[PDB]
């Protein structure tokens, strides 16, 4: 069956710049003078959407910043210029022979200036404490690049595990990311110690950003 290999798997491009996305098929996908390769855009959360068909034809309603070239085995999707809401995964697909097959996708990331997180920390709610559980939560908001470490400290000793980190997809307007980090304890372990800290380490500073609270106030 025809294998499509896209590259890169992942691509960071600045606003206003040109993105180049490749797809190579293991067999020629040409027939009757055409190249049966298509490109789709998928924004996260959403169905794919047709950008280009038969290698180079622009689907209607799709802006001319998107263009496709190539024939036989090598194909290119170009985005030019790239805009903030192009954050998506792009997929090539052949339909020259059954079964139709898809490349593994290329995830387009917008490259923008560095931005430090805004960190907020929150103790367990009295509601949760009544259940006998205890989650401490730390929001790390509007940062770039995506790469960030959160370190949890309880009275100055570091805790893993019980930590769940979860990032948003890159914002399609400001191109930043947010993260939440949740440390889950038992009500009893929670009530045993006093000081809780969420430390965010990011390339914006040689210096961790710290937020803390003391359970007894």
């Amino acid at each position: 069956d025809i294998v499509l290999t896209q590259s890169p798997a992942s691509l960071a491009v600045s606003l206003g710049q040109r993105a180049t996305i490749s797809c190579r098929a293991s067999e020629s996908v040409d027939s009757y003078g055409n190249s049966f390769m298509h490109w789709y855009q998928q924004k996260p959360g959403q169905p794919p959407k047709l950008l280009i068909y038969r290698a180079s034809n622009l689907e209607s309603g799709i802006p001319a910043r998107f263009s496709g070239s190539g024939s036989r085995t090598d194909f290119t999707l170009t985005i030019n210029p790239v805009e903030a809401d192009d954050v998506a995964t792009y997929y090539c697909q052949q339909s020259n022979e059954d079964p139709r097959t898809f490349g593994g996708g290329t995830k387009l990331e917008i490259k923008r200036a560095d931005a430090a997180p805004t960190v907020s920390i929150f103790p367990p709610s009295s509601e949760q404490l009544t259940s006998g559980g205890a989650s401490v939560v730390c929001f790390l908001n509007n940062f770039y690049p995506k790469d960030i470490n959160v370190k949890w400290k309880i009275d100055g000793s570091e805790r893993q595990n019980g930590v769940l980190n979860s990032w948003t997809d890159q914002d399609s307007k400001d191109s930043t990311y947010s993260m939440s980090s949740t440390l889950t304890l038992t009500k009893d372990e929670y009530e045993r110690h006093n000081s809780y800290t969420c430390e965010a380490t990011h390339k914006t500073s040689t210096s961790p950003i710290v937020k803390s609270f003391n359970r007894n106030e």
Partner: protein
């Protein structure tokens, strides 16, 4: 416009079946081939098979032969896929898509809204919703981040809205993660200091799978 509306999320036990639908509008259902496509979280797309409504004929990816079955209801412009002997391998998003172009080798010009299938033994559980507000006596500094932690529910998903959608631009939704076989997600909103707490803030959490909605007022401790 051409629309393909797909049936809602489905939770199915291992070994059971599921049947899902795709309603066409804005065009002649009987005039187009309908294809189906599997997307497993949230990466690779695989073509399943196709069906001609009016007529028709159908065909499958060999990988999906034992597994999938395509049917149509022409009277009601609805295409159907049924999946049998489900494994966690079949937990995925399924799309229907219209085939365009002049031929058998056509591209897909419209995609349906996607049906999410979870294959699991874990029981439907509603979420606990806890407020996330300052704090320890003081607010700092010029903007205030509030949140709701939505915890211990199954299956996915939930929807969190803030002041019935009045807060919007500031909302961050954090994807759900599975701990101890239950889901936890959170959502934050940020408002101006000068506004809080005088202007009250409520997160509403919907878990359609358990028909439960919960509102939480973001009181200060």
């Amino acid at each position: 416009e051409v629309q393909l509306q797909q049936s809602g999320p489905e939770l199915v036990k291992p070994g059971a079946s599921v049947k899902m639908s795709c309603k066409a509008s804005g065009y002649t259902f009987t005039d187009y081939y309908m294809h189906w496509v599997k997307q497993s979280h949230g990466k690779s797309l695989e073509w399943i098979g196709y069906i001609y409504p009016n007529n028709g004929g159908n065909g499958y990816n060999q990988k999906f032969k034992g597994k999938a079955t395509l049917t149509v209801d022409k009277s009601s412009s609805t295409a159907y896929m049924e999946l049998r002997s489900l494994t966690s391998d079949d937990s995925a998003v399924y799309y229907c898509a219209r085939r365009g172009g002049y031929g058998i080798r056509g591209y897909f010009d419209v995609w349906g809204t996607g049906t999410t299938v979870t294959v699991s033994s874990a029981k439907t559980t509603p979420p606990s919703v806890y407020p996330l507000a300052p704090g320890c006596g003081d607010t700092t500094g010029s903007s205030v981040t509030s949140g709701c932690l939505v915890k211990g529910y199954f299956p996915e998903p939930v929807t969190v809205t803030w002041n019935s959608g009045s807060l919007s631009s500031s909302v961050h939704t954090f994807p759900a993660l599975l701990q101890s076989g239950l889901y936890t997600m959170s959502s934050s909103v940020t408002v101006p200091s000068s506004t809080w707490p005088s202007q009250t803030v409520t997160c509403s959490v919907a878990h359609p799978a358990s028909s439960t909605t919960v509102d939480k007022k973001l009181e200060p401790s």
